[PDB]
Symmetry: C3
Subunit: 146 residues, 3 copies
Amino acid sequence: LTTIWSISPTPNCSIYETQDANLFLCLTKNGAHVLGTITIKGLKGALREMHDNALSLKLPFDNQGNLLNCALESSTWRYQETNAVASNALTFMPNSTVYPRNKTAITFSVVYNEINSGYAFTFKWSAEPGKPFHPPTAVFCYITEQ
Amino acid sequence: LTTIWSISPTPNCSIYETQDANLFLCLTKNGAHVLGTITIKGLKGALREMHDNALSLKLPFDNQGNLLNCALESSTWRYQETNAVASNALTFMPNSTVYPRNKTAITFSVVYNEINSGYAFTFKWSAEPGKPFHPPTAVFCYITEQ
Amino acid sequence: LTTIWSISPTPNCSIYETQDANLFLCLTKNGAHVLGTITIKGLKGALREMHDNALSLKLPFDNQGNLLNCALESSTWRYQETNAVASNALTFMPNSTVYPRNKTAITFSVVYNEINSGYAFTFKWSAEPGKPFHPPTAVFCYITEQ
């Protein structure tokens, strides 16, 4: 399996209130690299008229590569090729030697494994107060766990 | 098949006059992502001494992923691995859900599916008047049709 | 084989003195493209308190894709999947038609095939005098030899 994504026609992400955003994250594995693209669109509430000037999204995983409860609707986190939920995706996780847990690591950033157990992505975007939250798509690349 | 490219030792692109440029576009598919690199070199005519300060190149495709008549010599648009023409390359086309047709979406840009039928890439570069057109190589990444 | 890397827990690179740095270079091949990430960390000597404001690293290869004697410890240059040394990696070499030998092609740059025989990567980073050498990770993409 090469691809995990969160494609959804309907809102699948909850930042300030339930299902107020659409998150499209796509990971494709090529050996030890994953290529990621991420697009987040604010749809309801304060995400249409921002008060803060930055927003973060954390996707936590267990030590086997399963998505844990978080802002993303887990039923939308699927292997694209089979359309099964993206369970046990250890070889898509950020490598814990290259990115040890809790190591230090419009603007965008991604930090890997800022979590006490398992794995994580922490995304951060700047935001413009008074405007809808809808940052440009970002592309990133990281080394995976074996 | 992983790779489509337009490699050519001789001019294979017509911007202002016949065969006045060399276009090297290389697409490699990794699951739902394509990684693209594009290099265009002006060789003859106004491309050696630009009058305008921007230039675009559109590559249109039918709904099956075949390149339609355009500035690129179609005989150079080939699957690298077999050296056959890159016919029916649907799974290299920009995804029409992620990039709906006609949706809004040195400088470089790529816009996907700005076309009424099928698929497209529209590339745009800035140019420096009075100088040859030969922008730096650009790398881009997009989500493919399934 | 998809992946070559230089992962090492201990110093594996010699810039000013023996084993004064850690080089982590990871190449993954997807058809005609390689995606590369490179991280270099200065560990000893002047690399902890720079005098110059730029540093280069050249990785030379023979015409068969074997790493030749250079600043990187060759025993750490391995196919990730088999953990064998990365011998005869011709299809990871920068394409000699796209990047002809000796053709012209914090800051980072990579130049391909600046060498009289075989293949090469030449990396260059800026550095801040008085500070340790530890530039941000860089990601790059190139076309491979067939």
